[PDB]
Design a protein around this ligand. Structure first.
Ligand SMILES: [Ca+2]
Lengths: 129, 132, 133
């Protein structure tokens, strides 16, 4: 399409590997196939202004980093001991065709949410160009 | 065709005072340049519906007031999130119908534990949903 | 053109049931959101984004639920189980493709449903159309 939207989730009990890209394997919505579950990366098809946001459940320290074409854009960290909390983050980015966007973790990589608390990553095109 | 959006982070290393307009000096995005880094305020040029949001890293108790208004600002809501001897990232958001000349911004409170740095960001964003 | 968008908060909510009712409207373009029931009603088919930031001091688990043809569709959950008596904001959100008549709302887990009631701070439920179908 001439639009772009996705909401993916991480469905697995094992957290990501430290200092690695966060893979979201399950899809709630992804009509253009912009987010690739095989690589864990979003790749721009339609240029323009996008909004990216995530809500990640964790029961130990977790820092989520948003990358845009190899560059770390933002980092948000949440610390917790045994109990469950939600780490959230987001940013507006004006992207060009082919640009990749993904989330990653650093040494703080926990994404083991308690039964009933999930992790989601959404993205959608707001202004075409 | 009115493409309006902004995302700015706080990198200034200085504490927040009570009732102080929280400034996000570092701009990542500022389409239509309706957001001002120097003040941390968004000023409506094109009236309409907007969505405003933020994610604040913090090392303690934090409360923020979302503000709206023209020459006199008023508070829409207050977002509070506490942390006892630990680090946190909190968030707030709001859809607001804006008139030309009105400005939206975040204002610090008595709970001012807010971190603005590499590896622990604090960001403020806003975008136009539909033009009036 | 359609401009469906809303934000509602809590102030004087009717308690009872697991549906979380955000009684006080800040914005409600095209009145999709019913402040009396806590439910959003889709008029314009398309992709919408919904999100919440709810305040708790103990244990809370929330989910954005929807319905189509009266059929309830359970979804993702988001919790905060700090349980220390201090303010904690649980947040969550997602894009939902809705058809005319579909309803969206936030539901709490009956065993973990503590939501702050007061004037110190606020809980919000927001939603808006991303693009029509
Ligand atoms: Ca907290």
């Amino acid at each position: 399409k001439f639009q772009s939207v996705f909401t993916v989730t991480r469905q697995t009990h094992q957290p990501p590997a430290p200092n690695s890209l966060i893979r979201f394997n399950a899809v709630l919505t992804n009509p253009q196939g912009d987010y690739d579950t095989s690589t864990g990366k979003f790749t721009c098809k339609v240029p323009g202004l996008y909004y990216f946001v995530y809500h990640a459940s964790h029961t130990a320290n977790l820092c989520v980093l948003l990358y845009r074409s190899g560059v770390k854009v933002v980092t948000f960290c949440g610390h917790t001991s045994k109990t469950n909390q939600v780490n959230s983050g987001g940013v507006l980015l004006r992207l060009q065709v082919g640009e990749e966007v993904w989330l990653a973790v650093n040494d703080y990589y926990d994404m083991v949410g308690i039964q009933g608390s999930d992790s989601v990553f959404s993205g959608f095109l707001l202004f075409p160009d | 065709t009115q493409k309006i959006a902004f995302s700015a982070t706080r990198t200034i290393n200085v504490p927040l005072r009570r009732d102080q307009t929280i400034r996000f000096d570092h701009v990542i995005t500022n389409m239509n340049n309706n957001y001002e880094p120097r003040s941390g305020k968004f000023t409506c040029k094109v009236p309409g519906l907007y969505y405003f949001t933020y994610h604040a890293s913090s090392r303690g108790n934090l409360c923020v007031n979302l503000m709206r208004g023209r020459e006199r600002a008023q508070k829409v809501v207050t977002f509070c999130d506490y942390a006892y001897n630990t680090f946190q990232v909190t968030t707030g958001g709001m859809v607001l119908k804006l008139e030309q000349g009105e400005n939206v911004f975040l204002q610090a409170t008595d709970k001012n534990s807010l971190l603005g740095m590499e590896g622990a960001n604090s960001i403020f964003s806003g975008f136009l949903l539909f033009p009036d | 053109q359609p401009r469906p968008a809303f934000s509602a908060i809590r102030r004087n909510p009717p308690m009872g049931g697991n549906v979380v009712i955000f009684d006080t409207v800040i914005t409600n373009q095209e009145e999709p959101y019913q402040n009396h029931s806590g439910r959003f009603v889709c008029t314009v088919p398309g992709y919408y984004y919904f999100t919440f930031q709810v305040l708790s001091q103990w244990e809370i688990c929330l989910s954005i639920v929807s319905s189509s043809r009266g059929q309830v569709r359970r979804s993702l959950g988001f919790c905060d189980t700090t349980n220390k008596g201090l303010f904690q904001v649980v947040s969550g959100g997602m894009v939902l493709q809705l058809q005319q008549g579909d309803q969206v709302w936030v539901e709490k887990d009956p065993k973990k449903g503590h939501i702050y009631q007061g004037s110190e701070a606020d809980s919000v439920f927001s939603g808006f159309l991303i693009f029509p179908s």
